[PDB]
Design a protein around this ligand. Sequence first.
Ligand SMILES: [Cl-]
Ligand SMILES: [Cl-]
Length: 71
Amino acid sequence: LQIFVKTLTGKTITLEVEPSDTIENVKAKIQDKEXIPPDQQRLIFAGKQLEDGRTLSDYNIQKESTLHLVL
Ligand SMILES: [Cl-]
Ligand SMILES: [Cl-]
């Protein structure tokens, strides 16, 4: 699955994931790309706050979905 993550400046991160990856796994991928610590990352998809222990499939996140990093 390819997904996009937008940083707080609008920078686009492109990630390769599996549909059952957890949000904790996605945060580690964001950390490797950008230096952002997982405990400062808050991710939103379609106005839903994503929880670390849940999976992308739990949120119906699909090919080319865009997640946002937020305060
Ligand atoms: Cl997985
Ligand atoms: Cl895993």
